[PDB]
Structure formats: C-alpha cells, structure tokens
C-alpha cells in the first residue's frame, strides 16, 4: 500500500527476496480466452507474455515458480504493480489477505496437500492479481488445484467463457475452496483410522500421529479464518473492479468457508478427545499390569517368608523329624494359596 | 520499542526535523524484523516442550513393563529354589532321577509358560 518498500537489515536497499523453499521449476502458462475462441501458451520467456496486458479479451497468466524474483519484478513493473505488493507476493510466511488498490486487487491465498503413508501437511501460497482484463497468478511450484477451470475453459463448459476476468477470479477461488473440502475428507479418514488405532492399541506411534494431526489442525484453523475474512471482503463492497453481477457467487464461497471452519473446529475437538482416550487407555493398561504384578507378589512373598521359616540352622527344631512335616507344610501352602485367591476374587481383580 | 520508533517517525516533532525521518523508518522496519523473529522463536520453543512430554512419558511404560516381567518371573522361581534348598533339609534322601536337572526343567517350563501368558493382550 505504501510507496516506500520495507527496509530489511543486512540486505542492500531496494532488494526483493523469495522467502519459500522451492527452487526446482519455473514455467509461465497463458490461457487467453474470448466469447468465441481460446488460446494456450506455455513458455519460460516473460517477454512473450507481457503484451497480453492490454488485450480486450480476458487473459489468465500463470507464472509458476517465484524464486525467479526477476520475472516477478518485470511483471510488476510492466503492469504497474507497487513494489510492496511484489514484496508481499514473494513473502511466503504470510497469512491470507486481500488488498484493494485503484487499478487492481491483490489476493493472498494458500493451498494444501496431504500425504498418505507419511502424514505431513504442506502449504503453498498462491497470489492473484486482477488488473484490467487480466488475472495474474503466481505459484511456488508445478501442481495446483485449478485444473477443472482449465478444462472448463478448454471445452467451453459453463458460463465462464462468456464472462470477464472477475468470473475467472471466482472460478480459481472456488476451486481452491473445493480442494479445501477434499483435504478435509482426507483428514477425516485419517482421524477415523487414528481413532480405531488409539482405541485398540496404545503405542508411541499413536501419540506421534495424533500430535502431528493436532498441529496440522491448528495450522488449518489459522489458515482458514483469514480466508473467510478475505472472502467476506470480496463480497461485501468491492467497489471498483468486481462487477455487481458476480457477488452472489462470492457469497456462496463465503458460506463454504464457514462450513470448512466449523468442520476443522469439530476435528480439533475430536482430536482432543482422542488424546484423553489414549491417556485413559494407557492408565488402564498400567493398572492391569499392576494388578497382575501385585497378584503374584502377594501370593508369593508370604510363601517366601514361610520358606525362610524352616530354613534357619538352629539347634532346636520342634519338628526335627516329625512325620509328614513336608506334607503338612504343603497343606498350609495350598490353603494359603486358595484363601488368597478367593479373597482377591472378592474384589473382582 | 516498536511503539517508540513508530512515534518517532510518525509524529515527527520539529526537533527531530524532516531529513532524518527515513532513517527512523528503517529502524522501525528493523524492529518489525526483530519482533517477528521473537514470535516465531516463541512458537518453536513452545512446540519443543510438548515434544519432551511426548518423549519421557513414553518411558515409564517400558520401564514398568520390564520391571513387571522380571519380578513376576524371578519371584516364584526364587520360592521354588528356596523350598528345594533350606538349612532344615528334610527332603527325600534318595535322588531317584536327576533331581537338579528335573528342577531346572521345571524352572524353564514355568518361565516359558509365564512368558507365553504375557503379551497375549499386548500389555507386556
């Protein structure tokens, strides 16, 4: 928003630094579509993409790989994007936000992918800029969620092909929310599996997985609340750039985000219940082990005491050669064992 | 400290003069950096402590398991040995079979039976 770019320490002034971790790949896809035709174009040359700024027909530019700060700088300079917006584009450790300017709207969103057989939740920040007839979109790496919008434009399906760029911004945001729902389904399946495992067999892997799931759910909450806020901001007023015809769609997406937030809060509560269940189950197992150990200890320590009796080398044995002394002490053996077994059965151990 | 620097570059009284405002803005951005780093470190350290609880609390169970198994195996065997060996030593004088190997075989059978009975429900 401000003209002056932020001044970091240890960096030469006026520098822009990519913040994330992905540097493998870079590619620019352009999908220019009109009422009667479309075009597709995948290159790594920024110059062939720049003239699409002033095209009357809507344009979709997808620049994947923002570690190339030079490409981001060139696109921002040509499109008139302020330097601070570019800094926010390159900053990854940033919660979702929406910013309104005179000639464009800048939206920061976040994707998510869940990995099977290795439960880790990963995030990737995508930025969208709606300028004039174009929708710039910046991505960290190959792999996104907007394939359905691509196919809809390719096959002239729906009302997307006959509308302006704001409907394209809608399509992308709704696809992102849809894959949020997909992620929630994956997480719910994992929660069911974890529930069965913890309730059936308490192990260290169980608490490891459950705590990782808890951290992931907290991260999801922290990501999903500002996204609801920014969709609210997109459908409340949005004066300059977004037409009044497209606001019911943004309202629909806002409702979807409300549902997602409710679901993630339910998941948090369920996971807390799972942690309590694990603690109770482990306490019960330790109690059972103590029951067993105490049973044998209580039925054998007095036995060792009576074995120590008649085990002392004293001159005067009362039953020094009494007949059936071993049978009578074994009878006392059996009687004591039986009576302690009966007594412990009274308390239902 | 961030609030102080904000006051310095925003209120800008005539004593501070206009030419030095950008330098105070730079220092404000540095304070922003510091605060963000402190908050991130706070989150990391708070996360670290829960890992310690996740670690040590998963040791008492194993220690208790090994103590339970060793005690429940070696106390009854100690009793059997104590019965078979005393200073009273009023026992059948004639050896019959190999008495000591038979006693050892009984010891091993009892130990194996106790081991098999354990971990049936995976309590160990």
């Amino acid at each position, epitope marked *: 928003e401000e003209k002056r770019l932020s001044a970091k320490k240890g960096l030469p002034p006026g520098t822009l*630094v990519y913040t994330g*971790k992905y540097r493998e790949d870079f590619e620019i896809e352009v999908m220019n579509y009109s009422i009667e035709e479309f075009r597709e174009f995948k290159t790594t040359d920024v110059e062939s993409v720049l003239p699409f700024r002033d095209s009357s027909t809507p344009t979709w530019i997808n620049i994947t790989g923002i570690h190339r700060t030079d490409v981001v700088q060139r696109v921002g300079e040509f499109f008139g994007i302020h330097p601070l917006v570019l800094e926010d584009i390159l900053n990854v450790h940033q919660r979702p936000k929406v910013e309104f300017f005179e000639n464009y709207v800048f939206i920061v969103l976040k994707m998510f992918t869940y990995d099977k057989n290795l439960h880790e939740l990963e995030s990737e920040q995508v930025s969208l800029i709606l300028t004039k007839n174009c929708v710039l979109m910046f991505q960290e790496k190959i792999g996104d969620v907007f394939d359905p919008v691509r196919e809809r434009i390719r096959y002239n399906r729906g009302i997307i092909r006959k509308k302006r760029a704001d409907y394209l911004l809608y399509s992308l945001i709704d696809a992102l929310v849809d894959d949020y729902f997909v992620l929630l389904e994956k997480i719910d399946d994992e929660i069911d599996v974890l529930e069965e495992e913890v309730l059936e067999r308490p192990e260290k892997e169980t608490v490891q997985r459950t705590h990782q799931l808890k951290r992931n759910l907290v991260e999801l909450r922290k990501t999903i609340w500002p996204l609801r806020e920014v969709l609210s901001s997109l459908y409340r007023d949005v004066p300059p750039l977004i037409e009044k015809e497209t606001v019911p769609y943004f309202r629909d997406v806002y409702d979807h985000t409300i549902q997602i937030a409710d679901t993630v809060e339910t998941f948090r509560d369920i996971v807390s219940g799972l942690l309590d269940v694990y603690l109770s189950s482990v306490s019960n197992k330790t109690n059972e082990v103590m029951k067993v150990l105490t049973i044998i200890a209580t039925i054998f320590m007095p036995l060792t005491f009576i074995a120590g009796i008649y085990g002392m080398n004293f001159e005067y044995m009362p039953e020094l050669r009494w007949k059936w002394g071993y049978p009578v002490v074994l009878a006392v053996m059996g009687v004591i064992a039986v009576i302690m077994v009966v007594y412990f059965k009274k308390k239902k151990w | 400290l961030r609030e102080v620097l904000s006051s310095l570059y925003r209120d800008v009284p005539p004593l501070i003069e206009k030419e030095t405002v950008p330098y105070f803005r730079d220092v404000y951005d540095h304070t922003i950096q510091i605060a963000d*780093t402190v908050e991130t470190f706070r989150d990391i350290v708070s996360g670290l402590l829960d890992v310690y609880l996740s670690s040590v609390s998963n040791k008492t169970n194993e220690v208790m398991k090994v103590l339970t198994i060793i005690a429940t195996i070696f106390m009854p065997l100690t009793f059997i040995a104590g019965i078979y060996g005393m200073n009273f030593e009023y026992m059948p004088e004639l050896r019959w079979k190999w008495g000591y190997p038979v006693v050892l075989a009984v010891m091993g059978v009892i130990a194996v039976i106790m081991v098999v009975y354990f971990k049936k429900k995976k309590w160990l």
Partner: antibody
Amino acid sequence: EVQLVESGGGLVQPGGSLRLSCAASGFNVSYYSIHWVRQAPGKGLEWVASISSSSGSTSYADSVKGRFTISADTSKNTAYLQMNSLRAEDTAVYYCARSYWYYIWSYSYGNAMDYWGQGTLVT
Amino acid sequence: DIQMTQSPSSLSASVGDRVTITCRASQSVSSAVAWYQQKPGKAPKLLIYSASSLYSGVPSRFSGSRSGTDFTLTISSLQPEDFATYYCQQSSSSLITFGQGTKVEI
C-alpha cells in the same frame, strides 16, 4: 542459458593497476548480486568484492579494501573490478559469480553463489 | 571477522562408504552456510545451501547438517565422480568468508 565470462588480466608489474570485466548473458545484472572470488595458485577460495547493481551497494574484503573498486553497468550488463596498487600476493584465478538471497528467519538472510564464471588469471 | 575451521585438511576414502566433512565457525552464524565442490582446474559448483537444503540439480546422496555452530557435509553413497575439494562458506555477514578446504582422494 546463463553464462558469466571474465576478461582483462594476465600480467602486470607490482604496484600496477588493471580492470577485469565480467559479462552477463541470460540474466540482468541489476536483479542479482555479482561477486568476485579469487583462488591463489595452489590455495583455497577467497572472497574479494560484491556489488548489487540495483542500489550500487559495495562490500569489500579487508584484504583488498581501498585497493580494489567494483562497479556495474546496467545497460552493458557487465560488472567490473578495477584493481589498484596490485601486489605480488594478489595473483590468483579471479572468478565471477552470481548469487541469490534466501531466507532463514525474519532477521537473518543468506546468499549462495549458483552460477560461476570460468575465471581469469592475474600475475 | 568470522573464520570457518574445516577439518580435516584432507581425507581419503574408498568408493561406496559414507564420508562426513565438518566445519566450525568462530562465532554465531545462524544458518547461512553453503557447500561448494571444485574439481581440479574448474569453477566451483554449489551443492548445499542454508546448511541443510540440497541445491537443485545435485544428486541426492549429498546432504548437510547444522549442530549449533558446527556444520557437517555427508556423502551417504560415495561415487567415483565425487572426488574434489569442498569448502564451507558462511554468509551471515556481508563479508563472506570461505573455509580452508577438504580434498577427497581414493
């Protein structure tokens, strides 16, 4: 696609002065930082200078501070290193490198040299 | 000034065995440590940056670690083509400083 080519060295009298030119192809000198790294004959790598042509920020090692002056021309896409009062110890294979900044924490940043030039010899 | 102590000065090992090269810094450099490979008569090649991140286009056998002020470079499954000199480079300050080097030989 990215190449860095150095030239302008090979022989000079002690106390002499000369300029080494690094030519950038495939990238813009004003969107990155250009470093000079020298390797003495049978020795290890040593950092000399670095310029960020966007703002003209210059940083010099204590060994060659004041003697060496680094500069960059944006239109020419070339970065120079004009040595002065050059000694006998200064002989090395002077490399030209391109670096990008990365992120560790909000307060700490690091840079790593990804593309290197072939280097030139100075005696 | 920040100095990086790269020990040992030179190491020898066979092919197919794990080799670790360590490096130590005189003071607190957060993580701005990079590893370079220089074959004889050639320009260096970056392998590890941020002391733990493997540079793109570099085989996955190479790896790095940081333990406070100690930094190590490991080669899990050594290959015949992994014979060169390796340097640890701090970059916390604007005065970049390299390490002495560690030549790997047969």
